[PDB]
Amino acid sequence: GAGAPVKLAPRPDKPLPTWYELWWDNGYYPGQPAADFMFGAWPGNMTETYYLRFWSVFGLALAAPFYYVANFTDETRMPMVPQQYPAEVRDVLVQRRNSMLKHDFSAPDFKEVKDRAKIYWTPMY
Amino acid sequence: FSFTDATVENMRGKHDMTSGMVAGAVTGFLFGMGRPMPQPVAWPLAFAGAAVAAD
Amino acid sequence: SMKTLADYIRWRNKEPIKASVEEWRPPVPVINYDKPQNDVLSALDKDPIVRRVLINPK
Amino acid sequence: MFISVLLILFALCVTLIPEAHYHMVRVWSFVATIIPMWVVTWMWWNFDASGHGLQMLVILGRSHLAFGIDGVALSLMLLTTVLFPICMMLLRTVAGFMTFILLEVLVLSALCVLDLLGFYILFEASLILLFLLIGRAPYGSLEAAYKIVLYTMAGSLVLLPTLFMIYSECGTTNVLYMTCAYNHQTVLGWGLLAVLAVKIPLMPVHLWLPEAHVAAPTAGSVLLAGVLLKLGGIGFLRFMLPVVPEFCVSVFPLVSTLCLVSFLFSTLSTLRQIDLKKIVAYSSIAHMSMVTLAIFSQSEFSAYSSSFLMIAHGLISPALFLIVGILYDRAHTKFILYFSGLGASMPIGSTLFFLFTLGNLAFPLFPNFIAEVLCMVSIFAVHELLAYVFCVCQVLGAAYGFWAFNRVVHGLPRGPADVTRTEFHTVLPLLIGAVWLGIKPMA
Amino acid sequence: EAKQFTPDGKYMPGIFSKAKPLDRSTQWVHKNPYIEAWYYRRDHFENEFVWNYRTTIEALWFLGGFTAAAYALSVFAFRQADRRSGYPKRQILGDEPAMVLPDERQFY
Amino acid sequence: GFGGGFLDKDSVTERVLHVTKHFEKIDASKVSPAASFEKDLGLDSLDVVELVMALEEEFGLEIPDAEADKIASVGDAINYICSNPMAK
Amino acid sequence: MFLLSVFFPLLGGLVNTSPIARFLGHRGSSIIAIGCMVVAFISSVVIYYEVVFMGCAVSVDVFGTWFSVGTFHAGWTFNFDLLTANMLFTVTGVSMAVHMYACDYMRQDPHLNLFLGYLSYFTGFMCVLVAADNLLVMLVGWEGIGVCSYLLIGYWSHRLSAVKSAQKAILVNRVSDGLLMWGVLWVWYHLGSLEYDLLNVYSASGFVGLSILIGAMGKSAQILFHVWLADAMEGPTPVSALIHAATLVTAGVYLLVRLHIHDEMFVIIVGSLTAFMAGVFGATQSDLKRVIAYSTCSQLGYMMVSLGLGETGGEASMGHLMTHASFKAALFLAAGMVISGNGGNQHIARYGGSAHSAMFTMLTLMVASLSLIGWPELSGFYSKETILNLAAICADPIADVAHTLLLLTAMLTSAYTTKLFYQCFMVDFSGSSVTPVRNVLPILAMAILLLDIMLKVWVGTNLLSGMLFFLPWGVKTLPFGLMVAGILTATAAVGSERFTLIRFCGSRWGFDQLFARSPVNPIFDLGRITWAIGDRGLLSVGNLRA
Amino acid sequence: TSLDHVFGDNSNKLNYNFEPMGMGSLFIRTMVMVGVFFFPVFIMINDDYKYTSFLDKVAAAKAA
Amino acid sequence: HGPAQTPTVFDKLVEVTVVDMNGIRHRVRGLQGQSLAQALVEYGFPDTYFFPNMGFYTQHIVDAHVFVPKEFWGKVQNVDPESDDGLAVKRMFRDIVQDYQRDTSFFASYITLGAEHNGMTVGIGPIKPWILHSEWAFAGVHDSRNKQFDKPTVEIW
Amino acid sequence: MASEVVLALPHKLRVMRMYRTGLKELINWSANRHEWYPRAYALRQEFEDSKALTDREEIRKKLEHGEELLARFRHWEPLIKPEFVGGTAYSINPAQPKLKFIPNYDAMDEYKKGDHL
Ligand SMILES: CCCCCCCCCCCC(=O)SCCNC(=O)CCNC(=O)[C@H](O)C(C)(C)COP(=O)(O)O
């Protein structure tokens, strides 16, 4: 059902703002700013202070289990060791840093295996 | 200008353009004190740049 | 009062003049209630009126 | 040389044509620029990539004027000779024909120069031509011409003492002996950096171009956009690296930081532009800064990547200028808020606007994409931080590009109808060239 | 409704035609005075500069500050690239005489 | 069909009358074209607002607030509808 | 038969956008598009059968090199492995039905043929992306599908909201693409080649995985990048269906699976967070399209977690993609049919009864909902349970948080999906539109989608389905019980009194507002400062009056 | 104006002053953007700092 | 467009009473949009009553020295004293007038006549001797019969 | 609190718009119209408890409290008809405004279609 009548945007009749290059006028009413929420009202009339206040606790509430589990529990929590493979087969699989087989605490070179698994960022010369 | 330049030269025990920069900044500040305020920064810049160019 | 070089320098230190003539505004749709809200806890969220008109009815 | 002199005399015959027979006037003026395009084609067919790094060598006695061809000069000549006939197609006066003929002659002569004094003399012989072009009485701005002419003269005057000092130091002005003598690299290096940082738009001394390229008409706009900035890059490649390397090295942090801040500020400044022509003006600055950093990187293939990017901009940006000129001439204004609903009004023209906008934004199936990939390869091999800085702000240019495109194209239809046969023909060479170089540039 | 052509081509300028002749200026817009004033002001915004508090603060903290940041970053990148190729300290502009341009004939 | 996006007078009048009679206080015989809401039908401001919303539902319209405030009688509403190309 | 899978949709789209389309009309354009889609689908089916079942990978020299300067060599070369075959088969099967639906949905649109041509371009460039053997062709496909999405979203160039949404999505994807380009630079500088088969890594410099994952998240609309997806509903229903089923959103996960060079911790954290956010987002709205988009985001997070688990997890994630695409497109198409039967109403609060729409659409929506929520012995059931079991046995203590988060997310998924179906049909009628459209072609498209869903069960995606992993009996039954709990709560359709949490959840956590003024308005201010203060100010050189 | 009685007039006026952002807020958010979107710079620099600290400890202990 | 009266010069006719330096009144007819001094030349004033403009890119413009009574002061188009054009005007005051300056001293080149200027009365202001180049000078004596209107050209060179 | 334009409304009109927008919001927070009916009846009744109020201070207190309640409860996702302002179907495909056409422009004034200089 195309062809619905649409209101136009009447041309301005008073001196323009210095920084008028943020109101998007496509020729039809209603226009909009350059981006939503940038100025004027927000749906629900909420403010940035409201959301900052809420996030100040919500973020830590979400993040807290991550730190606790990453800093107070180790691979001994799992009641089994990872999938086993022969030496000539495992020796290549664990070379990957992303490879999960490093978490076998029963590995003959377990601490050494975890030692190689650390991540660097700048290539060293 | 001359007094401050030689002062810095003796103070630093060596010769470079920095002493001229200090002399130019001081000269511009002394010249620029008590005037409207695009000046007290500009005049030391002018004198210091002149000293740098001279070196 | 020494006539000096700076007297010929057009120092860029004159405040620009604006005008009191009304500026343009694009029309925007009306919002009946657009008071900026800032509180997470507001007793209005536990207002008995809201209970009576929303939660109490069957 | 003989052929070149024949073309030089043949081009001058325009003034000798009586104005009564306008048809033949247009024919002669167009053909005079047509011929060098075929001549450069013949040169490219004559070149040997298995031969020396320089071929077709010629020297005019003790009169300096050393002319030789590399890949960079040949490619730049090809691009320019493609550009110029379109510019001729947009002029209506004999004076414009003569000015652009002289400009093309000067550009071609400088493009293959091998004498630093020769480059100095031949390059800025067009400054008065640009001055007369930009500040035309009915529509031009005298201030823009004043600006650009003063900037160019300041650069040349800074360079000249260095040029004569190295001349006296080595007893000559040929590059192949200037490159072989010990010299006080620092002073000549400052001179070269000053000139080629004025010519190529580099912050802080770059402000002439936004006024100049906008005040000029369409033909001169395309000329200035696609040619004179590349005179800076070929200037670097042909002179500065072969002659004074130590200055190039010790200035590398300065050049890199200046290019980076130029790119960043130009990219951010563009969004606040309110005119399409000014938007196109700021667009070229980032490309030139990227070219300069690629040249200065010298990591793996810097010269070739820089040449590729120069060709890509000299191909795409003139199309943006063509669209801007068509819209202005058939609209009598360049102000954005008078552009709307262009797609329904100018379907093919708006499609071309979209395509060349994407071309400016380095998208695949376009030479600009491969160009920026190679430039970032060169930058990355030197260091990864500079490459990241170039990579991170890719969104910020496309931001203003898409915003302006959508604002002027979509919405309420109002303004001119679509393009004409002449306008589509003017657009055509850039589209075909961009497609050809974005699909199979090499073989 | 005019006739700017003949039945066999031959564009007629129609100087003495009552009807308004279609031309290059046919689709010109009607300029809005406020828009023209705004565009002149923005093209001539240079007269609005002043050394106020805000302008100076912004110029120093952003423009010069990020200039210094990029300069120091370039110095860091250059020195790190030198160290990642086995080269000793190199002489930047104003860095005392030192090694420049490592020879192609030396293994570093 | 009929109308440049507009419906007939008669079905609009019939729909408005049919909507109007949905009040306990209202006697049917006193509803007629161009009838006063308050003075004739004796409906309060809440009733007028409810009738505006109900007619908006019936004709599928989102009436602007000022125009709704202008609505104070049957004939005004009918003529307003007779101006709407957006009414179904 | 091999190059037919890629070149044929491209040629069809070119014809549909060529001046030749002037001489055909919408009837002919629909015929050409449907024929091209069917032929490419047949070729893709043959390639899938041969590759998956008989293990025959084929490499193609197409146009010679693209550009080879220095040690950098880029070639127009195509290779078809199990991954490429799966991607091509899924994309073609989706887009064929998408084209079938679009041939009928937009029948009263003026410029239908342009819409068809852009859809064909989108499908062809997706095929180009998946056909890539080296990273440059992957980039080409990435940007081509981005351009096609830009054109398709901004199809109705007369609505400013759609234009804003398209520009926002393009800029976000361009940020992701810059990150991806930096990653590609690193990959070539430290590996010397671009072909994936020549990319075998054990321990990189970290930035590789980080940048690649960020670029992938940009396309997959993960956490910190999901805002664009909801606004994409401004476009026509076929565009949203095609984008959310097998293209664009899938490309990031496809690249990650092809690469397998990520870092497990960051992948798992991002995936779990995104899944939780999508789950809480989907149950808190009233626009039908936005809920399905957020469900798409949640399934993307599921796939992210799976691929972060390991190689087996990566293959399970690929199977999850393969099963998800079909019913995602089915949900989009059924929603579009119901909306059209509701006079363009795109809000749930005006639905109800069994009079507005056809029986087949209702049954298709029911089947798609059942499959998506993991109803026992179904398409999404197998993949979701496999990912859950592989996530219930991970060696990372980090994953324990992810397992609980995904359990909650699945329960919320069942919740809002059952609420969707309930508001669509179970509730009493509360709107004003009944035009039940019973055209053959969209019904046949739904039939094809449902047949593919049946095939995904009757024939497994990989060997993982049926591989039993040893869990306590309660653990396996846990997602089943969670879906039951969601069913019960949604069929209750009850709500809470804590209205501040409601207003927070409905706002999409204010992320759009946060990005409106933390980066964006400061970018504008930096632009004004640069231009005015520097150029016309500090960098300005004035005139010497005389 | 022929559609005002259908879709609203131009009576209501936008409440925007067109003014530059708060200086301190603008500065803080610029720094936040720089930190979020230039993390590789800090990562590389901190890597170099850790590396030179390692070298410094080695130098201190190796000469005694 | 209707019965609007035909356009006649009367509707744009402007009359100004001009009195010479010898105290002789003279009737002059002026036209809207043109400068006063152009009409003054058109009347037959001696060449000594005029002088080149002392500005840049305007030295081909003639002018005469006149006195503006108090009422018509506001009809003189404004000129920036800080402008380069204003600097040229101040050079004109500095050189041509010297101690002939009066608070009513003005330049006719900046007088664009209009409806209000009808009936306005001004007189000629005295000037000091001057020289621009070889072909156009002022001896300081107003003894001549040659009409400035009779010069074929205005050679700045 | 309402907006400044609503602040300018007459007391009768102010309360009318208050009640109207309250019904709109109750629809906006409603699961269904069927849920909205008893809420509508209760909302109508609550105003009925304030019909006979005369002291303008307490009247203003009640009005202000209700306005604050409504402002706190602005719905983020309003229910709009598709083809009105803010609706999804608004501004999709309008009729083309009349645009003049220029025939055979290249044919006019040939050899003189360039640029002056
Ligand atoms: C989610 C819900 C949020 C809260 C919504 C607000 C709930 C609070 C409502 C309670 C406060 C009130 O009723 S507001 C108080 C309204 N009543 C009065 O002010 C006294 C009467 N004054 C009059 O002028 C007229 O009788 C008048 C009846 C106004 C006009 O009716 P008519 O023109 O026909 O004559």
PDB file of N, CA and C in Angstrom, chain D residues 294-342:
ATOM      1  N   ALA D 294      53.755   5.937   3.226  1.00  0.00           N
ATOM      2  CA  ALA D 294      54.171   4.756   2.481  1.00  0.00           C
ATOM      3  C   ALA D 294      55.522   4.974   1.814  1.00  0.00           C
ATOM      4  N   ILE D 295      55.727   6.151   1.220  1.00  0.00           N
ATOM      5  CA  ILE D 295      57.015   6.462   0.604  1.00  0.00           C
ATOM      6  C   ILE D 295      58.117   6.443   1.653  1.00  0.00           C
ATOM      7  N   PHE D 296      57.876   7.098   2.786  1.00  0.00           N
ATOM      8  CA  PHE D 296      58.914   7.225   3.796  1.00  0.00           C
ATOM      9  C   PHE D 296      59.183   5.913   4.515  1.00  0.00           C
ATOM     10  N   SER D 297      58.272   4.941   4.412  1.00  0.00           N
ATOM     11  CA  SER D 297      58.465   3.667   5.093  1.00  0.00           C
ATOM     12  C   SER D 297      59.603   2.867   4.468  1.00  0.00           C
ATOM     13  N   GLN D 298      59.615   2.746   3.137  1.00  0.00           N
ATOM     14  CA  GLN D 298      60.698   2.086   2.400  1.00  0.00           C
ATOM     15  C   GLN D 298      60.929   0.656   2.877  1.00  0.00           C
ATOM     16  N   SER D 299      59.866  -0.040   3.276  1.00  0.00           N
ATOM     17  CA  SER D 299      60.021  -1.317   3.983  1.00  0.00           C
ATOM     18  C   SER D 299      60.237  -2.485   3.026  1.00  0.00           C
ATOM     19  N   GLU D 300      59.243  -2.775   2.187  1.00  0.00           N
ATOM     20  CA  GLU D 300      59.316  -3.897   1.258  1.00  0.00           C
ATOM     21  C   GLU D 300      59.105  -3.455  -0.184  1.00  0.00           C
ATOM     22  N   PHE D 301      57.928  -2.911  -0.492  1.00  0.00           N
ATOM     23  CA  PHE D 301      57.639  -2.298  -1.790  1.00  0.00           C
ATOM     24  C   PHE D 301      56.901  -1.000  -1.479  1.00  0.00           C
ATOM     25  N   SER D 302      57.668   0.072  -1.296  1.00  0.00           N
ATOM     26  CA  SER D 302      57.083   1.357  -0.931  1.00  0.00           C
ATOM     27  C   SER D 302      56.794   2.205  -2.162  1.00  0.00           C
ATOM     28  N   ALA D 303      57.739   2.253  -3.102  1.00  0.00           N
ATOM     29  CA  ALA D 303      57.553   3.064  -4.301  1.00  0.00           C
ATOM     30  C   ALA D 303      56.363   2.571  -5.113  1.00  0.00           C
ATOM     31  N   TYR D 304      56.262   1.256  -5.304  1.00  0.00           N
ATOM     32  CA  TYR D 304      55.173   0.710  -6.109  1.00  0.00           C
ATOM     33  C   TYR D 304      53.825   0.934  -5.437  1.00  0.00           C
ATOM     34  N   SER D 305      53.755   0.721  -4.120  1.00  0.00           N
ATOM     35  CA  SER D 305      52.509   0.951  -3.396  1.00  0.00           C
ATOM     36  C   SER D 305      52.100   2.415  -3.459  1.00  0.00           C
ATOM     37  N   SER D 306      53.066   3.318  -3.292  1.00  0.00           N
ATOM     38  CA  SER D 306      52.781   4.743  -3.374  1.00  0.00           C
ATOM     39  C   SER D 306      52.283   5.123  -4.760  1.00  0.00           C
ATOM     40  N   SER D 307      52.914   4.580  -5.802  1.00  0.00           N
ATOM     41  CA  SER D 307      52.459   4.836  -7.164  1.00  0.00           C
ATOM     42  C   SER D 307      51.043   4.320  -7.370  1.00  0.00           C
ATOM     43  N   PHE D 308      50.753   3.126  -6.852  1.00  0.00           N
ATOM     44  CA  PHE D 308      49.413   2.563  -6.970  1.00  0.00           C
ATOM     45  C   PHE D 308      48.383   3.466  -6.307  1.00  0.00           C
ATOM     46  N   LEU D 309      48.690   3.965  -5.108  1.00  0.00           N
ATOM     47  CA  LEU D 309      47.749   4.839  -4.413  1.00  0.00           C
ATOM     48  C   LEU D 309      47.582   6.172  -5.134  1.00  0.00           C
ATOM     49  N   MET D 310      48.680   6.726  -5.653  1.00  0.00           N
ATOM     50  CA  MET D 310      48.591   7.969  -6.408  1.00  0.00           C
ATOM     51  C   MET D 310      47.698   7.800  -7.628  1.00  0.00           C
ATOM     52  N   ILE D 311      47.885   6.706  -8.366  1.00  0.00           N
ATOM     53  CA  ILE D 311      47.030   6.423  -9.513  1.00  0.00           C
ATOM     54  C   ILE D 311      45.583   6.262  -9.071  1.00  0.00           C
ATOM     55  N   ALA D 312      45.363   5.565  -7.955  1.00  0.00           N
ATOM     56  CA  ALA D 312      44.002   5.324  -7.493  1.00  0.00           C
ATOM     57  C   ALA D 312      43.286   6.628  -7.163  1.00  0.00           C
ATOM     58  N   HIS D 313      43.968   7.547  -6.473  1.00  0.00           N
ATOM     59  CA  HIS D 313      43.317   8.813  -6.148  1.00  0.00           C
ATOM     60  C   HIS D 313      43.104   9.653  -7.398  1.00  0.00           C
ATOM     61  N   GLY D 314      44.124   9.753  -8.257  1.00  0.00           N
ATOM     62  CA  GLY D 314      43.972  10.489  -9.500  1.00  0.00           C
ATOM     63  C   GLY D 314      42.928   9.904 -10.426  1.00  0.00           C
ATOM     64  N   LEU D 315      42.522   8.660 -10.188  1.00  0.00           N
ATOM     65  CA  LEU D 315      41.402   8.066 -10.906  1.00  0.00           C
ATOM     66  C   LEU D 315      40.064   8.393 -10.248  1.00  0.00           C
ATOM     67  N   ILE D 316      39.960   8.186  -8.937  1.00  0.00           N
ATOM     68  CA  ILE D 316      38.656   8.235  -8.284  1.00  0.00           C
ATOM     69  C   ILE D 316      38.247   9.666  -7.965  1.00  0.00           C
ATOM     70  N   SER D 317      39.110  10.425  -7.291  1.00  0.00           N
ATOM     71  CA  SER D 317      38.736  11.772  -6.871  1.00  0.00           C
ATOM     72  C   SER D 317      38.248  12.667  -8.009  1.00  0.00           C
ATOM     73  N   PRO D 318      38.842  12.654  -9.212  1.00  0.00           N
ATOM     74  CA  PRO D 318      38.265  13.458 -10.298  1.00  0.00           C
ATOM     75  C   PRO D 318      36.832  13.101 -10.611  1.00  0.00           C
ATOM     76  N   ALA D 319      36.412  11.856 -10.378  1.00  0.00           N
ATOM     77  CA  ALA D 319      35.007  11.515 -10.561  1.00  0.00           C
ATOM     78  C   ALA D 319      34.129  12.228  -9.539  1.00  0.00           C
ATOM     79  N   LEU D 320      34.589  12.302  -8.289  1.00  0.00           N
ATOM     80  CA  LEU D 320      33.872  13.080  -7.286  1.00  0.00           C
ATOM     81  C   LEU D 320      33.757  14.532  -7.722  1.00  0.00           C
ATOM     82  N   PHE D 321      34.856  15.094  -8.231  1.00  0.00           N
ATOM     83  CA  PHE D 321      34.810  16.464  -8.729  1.00  0.00           C
ATOM     84  C   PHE D 321      33.888  16.607  -9.933  1.00  0.00           C
ATOM     85  N   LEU D 322      33.840  15.605 -10.809  1.00  0.00           N
ATOM     86  CA  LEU D 322      32.934  15.654 -11.953  1.00  0.00           C
ATOM     87  C   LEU D 322      31.486  15.708 -11.492  1.00  0.00           C
ATOM     88  N   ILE D 323      31.129  14.849 -10.537  1.00  0.00           N
ATOM     89  CA  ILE D 323      29.767  14.840 -10.014  1.00  0.00           C
ATOM     90  C   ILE D 323      29.448  16.168  -9.342  1.00  0.00           C
ATOM     91  N   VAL D 324      30.392  16.692  -8.557  1.00  0.00           N
ATOM     92  CA  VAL D 324      30.183  17.975  -7.891  1.00  0.00           C
ATOM     93  C   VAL D 324      29.965  19.076  -8.922  1.00  0.00           C
ATOM     94  N   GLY D 325      30.789  19.091  -9.969  1.00  0.00           N
ATOM     95  CA  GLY D 325      30.665  20.123 -10.984  1.00  0.00           C
ATOM     96  C   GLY D 325      29.362  20.035 -11.749  1.00  0.00           C
ATOM     97  N   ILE D 326      28.940  18.818 -12.099  1.00  0.00           N
ATOM     98  CA  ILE D 326      27.661  18.648 -12.780  1.00  0.00           C
ATOM     99  C   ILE D 326      26.529  19.158 -11.901  1.00  0.00           C
ATOM    100  N   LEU D 327      26.538  18.764 -10.625  1.00  0.00           N
ATOM    101  CA  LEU D 327      25.476  19.176  -9.716  1.00  0.00           C
ATOM    102  C   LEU D 327      25.451  20.686  -9.543  1.00  0.00           C
ATOM    103  N   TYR D 328      26.622  21.312  -9.417  1.00  0.00           N
ATOM    104  CA  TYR D 328      26.661  22.758  -9.241  1.00  0.00           C
ATOM    105  C   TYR D 328      26.197  23.485 -10.496  1.00  0.00           C
ATOM    106  N   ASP D 329      26.730  23.104 -11.658  1.00  0.00           N
ATOM    107  CA  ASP D 329      26.380  23.801 -12.889  1.00  0.00           C
ATOM    108  C   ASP D 329      24.891  23.676 -13.178  1.00  0.00           C
ATOM    109  N   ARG D 330      24.338  22.466 -13.053  1.00  0.00           N
ATOM    110  CA  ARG D 330      22.906  22.288 -13.253  1.00  0.00           C
ATOM    111  C   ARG D 330      22.098  22.558 -11.991  1.00  0.00           C
ATOM    112  N   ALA D 331      22.718  23.162 -10.978  1.00  0.00           N
ATOM    113  CA  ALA D 331      22.007  23.597  -9.780  1.00  0.00           C
ATOM    114  C   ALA D 331      22.320  25.024  -9.358  1.00  0.00           C
ATOM    115  N   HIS D 332      23.435  25.609  -9.799  1.00  0.00           N
ATOM    116  CA  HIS D 332      23.868  26.968  -9.478  1.00  0.00           C
ATOM    117  C   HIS D 332      24.232  27.144  -8.009  1.00  0.00           C
ATOM    118  N   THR D 333      24.339  26.059  -7.249  1.00  0.00           N
ATOM    119  CA  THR D 333      24.783  26.147  -5.867  1.00  0.00           C
ATOM    120  C   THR D 333      25.458  24.842  -5.479  1.00  0.00           C
ATOM    121  N   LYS D 334      26.289  24.920  -4.440  1.00  0.00           N
ATOM    122  CA  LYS D 334      27.019  23.768  -3.926  1.00  0.00           C
ATOM    123  C   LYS D 334      26.633  23.456  -2.488  1.00  0.00           C
ATOM    124  N   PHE D 335      25.609  24.125  -1.971  1.00  0.00           N
ATOM    125  CA  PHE D 335      25.254  24.039  -0.563  1.00  0.00           C
ATOM    126  C   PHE D 335      24.420  22.787  -0.328  1.00  0.00           C
ATOM    127  N   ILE D 336      24.790  22.020   0.700  1.00  0.00           N
ATOM    128  CA  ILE D 336      24.269  20.665   0.852  1.00  0.00           C
ATOM    129  C   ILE D 336      22.757  20.673   1.041  1.00  0.00           C
ATOM    130  N   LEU D 337      22.243  21.588   1.867  1.00  0.00           N
ATOM    131  CA  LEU D 337      20.826  21.550   2.224  1.00  0.00           C
ATOM    132  C   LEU D 337      19.897  21.801   1.043  1.00  0.00           C
ATOM    133  N   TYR D 338      20.432  22.043  -0.151  1.00  0.00           N
ATOM    134  CA  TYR D 338      19.631  22.117  -1.362  1.00  0.00           C
ATOM    135  C   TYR D 338      19.710  20.841  -2.186  1.00  0.00           C
ATOM    136  N   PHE D 339      20.327  19.792  -1.651  1.00  0.00           N
ATOM    137  CA  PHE D 339      20.435  18.505  -2.323  1.00  0.00           C
ATOM    138  C   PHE D 339      19.595  17.484  -1.571  1.00  0.00           C
ATOM    139  N   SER D 340      18.667  16.844  -2.275  1.00  0.00           N
ATOM    140  CA  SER D 340      17.808  15.841  -1.657  1.00  0.00           C
ATOM    141  C   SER D 340      17.088  15.059  -2.742  1.00  0.00           C
ATOM    142  N   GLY D 341      16.813  13.794  -2.445  1.00  0.00           N
ATOM    143  CA  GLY D 341      16.099  12.936  -3.378  1.00  0.00           C
ATOM    144  C   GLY D 341      16.784  12.807  -4.720  1.00  0.00           C
ATOM    145  N   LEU D 342      18.113  12.708  -4.721  1.00  0.00           N
ATOM    146  CA  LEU D 342      18.859  12.701  -5.972  1.00  0.00           C
ATOM    147  C   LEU D 342      18.742  11.375  -6.709  1.00  0.00           C
TER     148      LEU D 342
END
